[PDB]
Each structure stands twice: as C-alpha cells, then as structure tokens.
Motif scaffolding. Sequence first.
Motif, PDB file in Angstrom:
ATOM      1  N   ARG A  11      56.597-114.735  16.624  1.00 29.00           N
ATOM      2  CA  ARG A  11      56.684-113.289  16.505  1.00 29.00           C
ATOM      3  C   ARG A  11      57.580-112.746  17.604  1.00 29.00           C
ATOM      4  O   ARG A  11      57.667-113.322  18.692  1.00 29.00           O
ATOM      5  N   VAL A  18      54.228-102.611  12.726  1.00 22.76           N
ATOM      6  CA  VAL A  18      54.736-103.950  12.452  1.00 22.76           C
ATOM      7  C   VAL A  18      53.599-104.880  12.041  1.00 22.76           C
ATOM      8  O   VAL A  18      53.756-105.719  11.146  1.00 22.76           O
ATOM      9  N   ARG A  21      52.653-103.954   8.517  1.00 25.81           N
ATOM     10  CA  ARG A  21      53.693-104.436   7.615  1.00 25.81           C
ATOM     11  C   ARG A  21      53.606-105.944   7.416  1.00 25.81           C
ATOM     12  O   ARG A  21      53.822-106.444   6.305  1.00 25.81           O
ATOM     13  N   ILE A  25      52.881-107.901   3.917  1.00 24.94           N
ATOM     14  CA  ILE A  25      53.437-109.169   3.453  1.00 24.94           C
ATOM     15  C   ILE A  25      52.323-110.182   3.209  1.00 24.94           C
ATOM     16  O   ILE A  25      52.306-110.878   2.186  1.00 24.94           O
ATOM     17  N   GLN A  85      59.408-120.547   7.896  1.00 19.51           N
ATOM     18  CA  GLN A  85      58.333-120.916   6.980  1.00 19.51           C
ATOM     19  C   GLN A  85      58.701-122.198   6.243  1.00 19.51           C
ATOM     20  O   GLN A  85      59.674-122.231   5.485  1.00 19.51           O
TER      21      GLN A  85
ATOM     22  N   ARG B 284      63.556-112.687  10.007  1.00 21.50           N
ATOM     23  CA  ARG B 284      62.270-112.007  10.102  1.00 21.50           C
ATOM     24  C   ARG B 284      62.434-110.505  10.304  1.00 21.50           C
ATOM     25  O   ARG B 284      61.630-109.726   9.781  1.00 21.50           O
ATOM     26  N   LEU B 288      61.173-107.549   7.889  1.00 23.86           N
ATOM     27  CA  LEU B 288      60.537-106.371   8.465  1.00 23.86           C
ATOM     28  C   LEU B 288      61.287-105.076   8.164  1.00 23.86           C
ATOM     29  O   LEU B 288      60.763-103.993   8.442  1.00 23.86           O
ATOM     30  N   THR B 316      60.534-123.820   0.096  1.00 25.17           N
ATOM     31  CA  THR B 316      59.503-122.790   0.230  1.00 25.17           C
ATOM     32  C   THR B 316      60.060-121.395  -0.035  1.00 25.17           C
ATOM     33  O   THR B 316      59.368-120.551  -0.628  1.00 25.17           O
TER      34      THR B 316
END
Lengths: 205, 484
Positions: A11, A18, A21, A25, A85, B284, B288, B316
């Motif tokens: 992060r 945030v 949010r 997700i 990911q 990311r 966001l 993925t």
Amino acid sequence: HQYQTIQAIPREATGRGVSARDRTIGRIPAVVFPQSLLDTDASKRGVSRKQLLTADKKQIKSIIDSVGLPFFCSTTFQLQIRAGQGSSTLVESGRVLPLKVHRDEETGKILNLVFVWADDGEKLKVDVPVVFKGLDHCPGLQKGGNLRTIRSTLKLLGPAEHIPSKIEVDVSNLDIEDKVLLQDVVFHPSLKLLSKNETMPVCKI
Amino acid sequence: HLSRPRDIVKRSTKKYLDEPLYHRLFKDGGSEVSVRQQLNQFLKGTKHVFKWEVGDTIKKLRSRGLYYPALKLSEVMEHRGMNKTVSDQAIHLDLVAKARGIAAGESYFVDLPETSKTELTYASLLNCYCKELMTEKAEGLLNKMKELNITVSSMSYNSLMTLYTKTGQAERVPGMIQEMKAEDVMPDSYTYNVWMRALAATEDVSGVERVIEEMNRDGRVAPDWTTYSNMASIYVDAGLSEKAEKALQELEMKNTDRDFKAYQFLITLYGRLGKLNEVYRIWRSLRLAMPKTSNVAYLNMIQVLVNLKDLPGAETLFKEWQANCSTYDIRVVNVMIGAYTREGLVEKANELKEKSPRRGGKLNAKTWELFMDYYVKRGETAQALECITKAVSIGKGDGGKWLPSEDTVRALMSQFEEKKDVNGAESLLEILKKGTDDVGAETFESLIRTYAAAGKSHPAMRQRLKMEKVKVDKATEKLLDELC
RNA sequence: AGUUGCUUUGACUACAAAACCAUGCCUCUCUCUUGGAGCGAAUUGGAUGAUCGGGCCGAGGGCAGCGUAGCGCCUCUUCCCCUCACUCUCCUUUCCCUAAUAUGACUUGAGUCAUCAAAGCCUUUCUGACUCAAAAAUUUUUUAAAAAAAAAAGUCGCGUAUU
C-alpha cells in the motif's frame, strides 16, 4: 497441510476514502510491524520494518470460515508479499502472528488487519483461549454435575515457532466437584506464562 | 443569477428538453449507430435547446471523433434559425473539412461572406491544410496571410511546425521559432513540445537541455504533463534512464487531474524502461482513480506485463477483466493469444480462440496473424494457409485490406522451396494476387526454382510480363530458359 | 352551401484550442453525471506500557445450623473502566484549502437576423445488426440408422480431505 500462507499486496495511499475505495474493490487495509515499535521506550524502538498492506477479501473470508473467528489471534501464518496481484516476483517473505481484526458490528465485514512479524526465535506474548474436550464422556457431567467455564484465555510467552493455536485439556477423568489447575495444563516446557494463576482452575464441576 | 440567465435546470419543460442535449445524445452508448439514432430521434421532436447547449454538444461530439453527427447537427440547427457567428463559422469550417474533405472545406470558405473571412477562419483552414499534409497550399495560405496583415497566432506557427515534423522537413523549425520570436509572438507549451520533437528528430539529444532552461527563464508558460511526456519519450528512445525517471516523476507530480491518457503514458513508459515495482505503483493509483476501469488500460497493462515477463500476473489480470468486463474486447484476448503462441503453450491459446465467440468476441485479423506466425515458426504450412485465408477474409477493422508481412512471406516461400510444394506456392501467389495488384519485391523474382520439381508451366516469360513489368535477378533466367 | 385543413416556425450566451511524441489491432471497444492520495486541523480513536482510584466473579480457612449442600460477618488479589505517557493504522462527527459545478467577463429601452413545404406514401439501391428456414457438426435415448438437446462464466448454500 500444517500452516496457512497469506498473500499480500503493498500500500502507498492511506486514508478513510482510500480505505473505503479499496473496500469497494474488495481489498482490506492492513499493516505489519515488529514488536519493538510497540514499546513505550524509543530506546527499545529499534529498526522496525513497519509496512502497509492490502489483503484479498476472498482469501481472508476463506481463512476465517476455515479456522474460526475468535481463534484468529492465536494461530500464526506465513506472510508472502508480492509487487502485484498474482505476480511471479516476491518482495519479502516470513512468518507473522496476527493480533487484531476490524469488523463492523452490523455485517461483520473485515475492515483492518494488524500483523506482527514472527521471525525465528522471537519471544512474543499471546492470549490463547482454551479448548475443553471430552464433554460427552465426562462422568461428572453425566451423573448430574455441570462444567462451569471459569477462565477463557491464558497468557503465554515464548518462541514464534511453538505457540499452540489452541489449548486443550482433558476433562473426561473428572467426577463431580472436581477441578484441574493451570499447572496441570499440557503445554510446552520452554514456554513461560506471565499469568497470575494462584489457587484457580481452568474448569470445575 | 444575472450572469447566466438561460439556466438548464430551471428552464421550462414544455418548450425545452428535460435533460441536456450532450447528455441525451449519449444515452445508448458512444457508438456511431446509437449517436446517429439519438440525433434522428431528437431532430423529429418538438423540444428545443439553447445555443450554448448546441455549442457544447458540438464540442463533445468532436472530442470523440464523431464528425458526421456533429456536422449534421450544426447544419440542421443553423437551417432552423440559429445564426452562426465568426467563431461558429470557424468551427463549422473545421467540421466540414473533417467530414466531407478539404475540397468541400475550400468551397465552404469561398462561399463564406467577406466580413466573415477573418483570422479565425484563416487559422482554421490552415490547420485543416496541415492536418491533411498539403505543403504547397499551406505556404500559399501563409504568404497570403502575411500579405493581408492578418494576425498570425501561435496556433498557426505550431500547425506549420507539426506539418514540417510530419512531412520530414524538420530542419525548418529552429528558423521558424526565431521567426515567431522576432515577430513578437509569445509561445505556448505545444511550441516547446514540437521544438523538442524536431530537435530529437535531428539526431541532437544535447539540444533539448537548452530549451527547458529557456522556458524556465521565460516564466510565462506553465509546464504541463505533456511536456514531460515528450521528455520521457525522447529520453527513453535515446536510452537515457535517470533523466527519464526525473521527467516521469515530474510528470506524476504534474498530473493533478488524474488523466487516463497520462496514466497510460506512465504505464507504457515505465514498461519500456522495465521497472516492474513502479509499474505496479502507477497501476494501483490507476485502480484508485477509476474503479470501473476501461479495456484500454488493461490492453496496455497486460502487454507491458508480458513484455516484462509476468505471465501469472497477466493470467490473474485476465480473470479480473473477465469478471469485470462489459464489452468482450478482442484485443485483450489477442495480446495473450500471441503470448501463448510465442511461448508455445498452444492448447490454452486454442481454448481462448474457441471460447471467445461464445462469450461475445468475434475474431479479427491479428489473432490469425499471430497464429500463422506460430505456424510459420513451427514449420507447418497448410495451417499457415488456413490462417492467411481467414485473415484476408476478415480484413482490417477500419475497412482496409489485410496484407501479410514481407519477412513472413519470404520465410514461407523459403519453406515452400524445400518441400517442393508447388501447389502451396501457387495458392500463396493467388492469395497475394487477390490481396494486392503489384505482387513482387522478392516474392517470385528469384523464386521460379520452386517449379524445379517436375516440369514447368507453359508461358515461358510471358506470365512474368503480365504483373506490371517485374524484373528478375540475372542468375534466375538460366534454369528458366534451360527448360524453355 | 357549411365545417375542418391550406394560415409559417425559430435563435439572440459574449466561445479559433479542431495543432501531440508513447503502446497501437478502429488506443478510450463506446468514458453523461465518482471528492481529495491535502503531510491540514478539533472531539474520537488506539497496533503500545505502568501508576492511582473505583467496581464484579472467585479463592481459601472460619465465627457459622444437619447424614454431602447452606444464611449474615471476616482475610484477599487477578479482571474491567478511568488516569498519565507513546501514538497514526482502521472507524464517527465537523471546520479550513483545492478540484468540480457549461465558456468568457442600458439599445428584445419592446428590436435585429434566419426560415418560408413540414408531415406522409410508393419504386429501387449501398452497408450493418436480429429472427431465423435448413444442413453439416458434439451429448443422451431407442433399434450402422432414427428422436431431443447443452457446450462458455459469475454468485449463494451443504457435507466432506489432497502441499
């Protein structure tokens, strides 16, 4: 298989919007740090690998439905951190002992995760709830007595390698008005307590 | 308020539309058919609109490349009673040149009145000249403007400089920037952008360091993320890395409006540099900045990840795109299709090929191009034939015609030479004949010798005069006239 | 002869930004309408450690009334809630700043400028999508043949063990 592996994502943006949010997700904010950061003394606050994380909703819920809710703080996991990911590349890895979930009282959705590194040879305090086995076969319970649940959790201090996820006792050998002290609890000999046991049992009929 | 009396919320519903026109025309989607259907349904109604409403509608339709409905709306609403001003006539002139061509735009400019032929119309016609790359008529407008003392704005000079850069006379830019500085014209950021691009095109990397210091000295132009995008592109193409990272970090600081194209630029520049952690760092932030991400960012991201060799991360991302996609984009499939044919895991590529049209993606030509690339790498030629036939049957997605690459054609014909597959060579030649009227650079000029298996064809150098006067190598006609 | 049609209808908002290098397959494959990642604050949080104070459960001997089990009085500290430090990683209420909210910053003072066949109908004709008609394809059933059918994914719930 013995232990569980938790996949995490780094992060960089922190805040309420945030976080909401990321939960929109389906990612739940989290943190990992050594224990030395938690000491009151900045002298003992040493080189701390404090780091921010996000966790997958499906994996967290799968682990929770697997192991149970109030036992979560006792068991340890293996944290694997990766840049993206499902990336084939890793940043770091290790073992961790959790201590805190955040859940709303309405729906129970996971909101925050607090994680403490559990490296080799680290001595950590932990609060472990106990497990009573042999209820259906207790002669005191069958003959007319009841098993009063006196104490829930016990304090344990020891290595990160050998903390039990649950504390089991044997109560199949107790008749009525019988009790078993905390010194008779089966636990590791290198493990220390730091608890005020005195003249108190874990259970009594 | 007294500033804006013609308010769109408090206006009457009996006379006007219940929702704004730029919201109404995009109800069914951004597609050409749905925009045309919405415009046809609106022009038949009895509800009316404002002039600023029509102006913003024209700008929104122009901003997505929808030129025909914008022109149709402008013409019809002018015909209904809305009078064009000079600015609206400039916009309509540009729309005419965008839709019906520059030959129609010139006639519109001629039919314009004389008091409407001012600097706005002249600059609009100049931009419509430079975008269509007509240097002689461009300069013929320039000396006419300089003769008539029409104020030449910085837009006209930037249009000429972009014309010079695209045509190939990029050396004229350093003279022209000093010309516009001598004629008391202040520049914008795009002036520095085209100056930097021409300087990098002149194989002069050390010149882009004296322009940034000059615009820092100026203090009058605001640096923007497009400037740092130009710096990042020039440095990454030049191989410099740390200055490119400084430019890209300044770009990230300058992107305060969270622009989708700017984020695409970060992703592709950091992918072409090769730094996976900061690629995911910008990614990311993109997730966001938009939760329902469009397919274009996925198209960039998965191609970056497979060019940086992160295949399970791409796998993925594929599942994420599957679970969150509204339109089954075929290019997203075709990235990992070519990936799985390049690393040879062909069963999963075949599975994606089978499962795409059920889920709703019809096959384009580039999937078949990647599979015939796979088959020409592995040596099977019949399946390359079956791929190229379906590729030329599909054709291009903008209305063009698909033509195979010269290197692949050359390799396939060299593969035909060994097995003496005269039937395969004839089928490939027939396919190229249907594709193009020319058919020859190296295709058959030194490639008569595939006929050296058993006999040869009749015509004896007269077929080789049919296809528009080809010429063969000197060492090729000897085995030809030996067998007569 | 009488009715109904033929009987005009709109805009006035001041606005050249339509010139872009990356990946590029028609790179926004379809974006109308989303608060902030401010190093910004106040109550609240607390991933943390003890002192002080208060407050249960409970632990014994007992003064106490039975053949096990007691009712008031008497020695105790765990455990909780405060309190003082450390404290920004999740949560509640607000306030500032930014972004966004369609451009820019008297003469319709009773006008100026456009429009002046709209709406239907009938023949063709270019290009897209849908229903399909039907066949070839694969599964089951029935006796190589005949009848009906799905293929690809997401989500919820149940019981059960392979790194």
